[PDB]
Structure 1
Amino acid sequence: GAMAQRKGAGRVVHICNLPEGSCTENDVINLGLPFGKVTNYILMKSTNQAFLEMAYTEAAQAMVQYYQEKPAIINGEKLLIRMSTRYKELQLKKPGKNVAAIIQDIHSQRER
C-alpha cells in the first residue's frame, strides 16, 4: 500500500475542464458525494479546474475509473477527475457550505 502515491493520510483529487461561470461548488461535489462523502473541495474558476477531497481513497479511484469510461459533462465539456501528482493534502483556504446538504441536492436532482 501507499506505493501509488501517499493517498491515505491525505488525499488530493483534482477535477478539471470546469468552465468559468459554470464552476459551481454543488455540482463538483454532486459528482463526489454519490461515490463517497466529500470532506473538502476547492474550485479554481481562474484555471477552469478544481479539487475534490473524499472520505476514502477508494472513492477517488472509483470516480476516476468511472469518468474514464463515462465522463461528467459540464457545458458540453468532459470533466477529467484524476489523483494529483503534486499535492498530498487539501487545505480549505476558502470556506464552503454544508456538504451534507449537497447530498440532499443530489437526491433532489432538479430541485425536488
Structure 2
Amino acid sequence: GSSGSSGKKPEGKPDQKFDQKQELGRVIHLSNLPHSGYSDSAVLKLAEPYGKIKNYILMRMKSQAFIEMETREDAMAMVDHCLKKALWFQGRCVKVDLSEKYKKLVSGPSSG
C-alpha cells in the first residue's frame, strides 16, 4: 500500500566542488601561412618548441590555423618570441597571436 518514503533509499556520500580556477583559456592563432598543400605536422611543429599541444584546427580559407597549448605560459612564450623576432615558415611571414575567443579547441558545438 502507501508509505512515508520512496523505495529508492539513500546511498553514497557527496563530493561536489563549489568554485575553483581549474584552468585558463589558451589557443594560439596562426595567419598568413604558406599554400604548398602540407601535412598538419608542418604547422604543429611551429608550436611544439614552445610547449605540448592538446588540439588543433587548420583552415585552408585565407591560410590560417588554431592550436590549443597545454599551458597559457607555453602559449604566451610563442607570442613573446614572435614579438621579439617574427616567425617564418616555407618562406612566408606568419602572423602569430593568442585568441581571446578560443579558450580550447573542440569539434562541433558544446551543446547536445
Q: What is the TM-score with the length of structure 1 in the denominator? A: 0.65
Q: Which runs of 5+ in 1 are unaligned?
A: 1-7, 94-112
Give the deviation of 1:91 after TM superposition. 0.9
Deviations 1:57-100 (A, max 9, x none): 1111000011122222123221122111223221145xxxxxxx
Distance 1:23-1:9 versus aligned 2 partners, 3 A rule: farther
Bigger-Rg structure (1/2): 2
Deviations 1:23-65 (A, max 9, x none): 5411221121111011111111112110011111111100001
Letter in 2 for 1:90: L
Q: Is the 8 A contact 1:23 1:45 kept in 2?
A: no
| Inter-partner Cα distance in structure 2 for 1:81 and 1:73 | 10
Determine the structure 1 residue equivalent to 2:102: 87
Distance 1:22-1:78 versus aligned 2 partners, 3 A rule: farther
Q: What RMSD over aligned residues (CA atoms) do the two structures have, in Å?
A: 1.9
Matched, 1:31 2:41: no
Determine the structure 1 residue equivalent to 2:7: none
Q: Which runs of 5+ in 2 are unaligned?
A: 1-22
Determine the structure 1 residue equivalent to 2:59: 44
Taking every aligned residue pair, what percent have the same amino acid on both sides?
38
| Aligned residue-pair number | 86
Matches within 5 A, 1:1-112: 8-22=23-37, 24-92=39-107
Q: What is the TM-score with the length of structure 2 in the denominator? A: 0.65
Letter in 1 for 2:106: Q
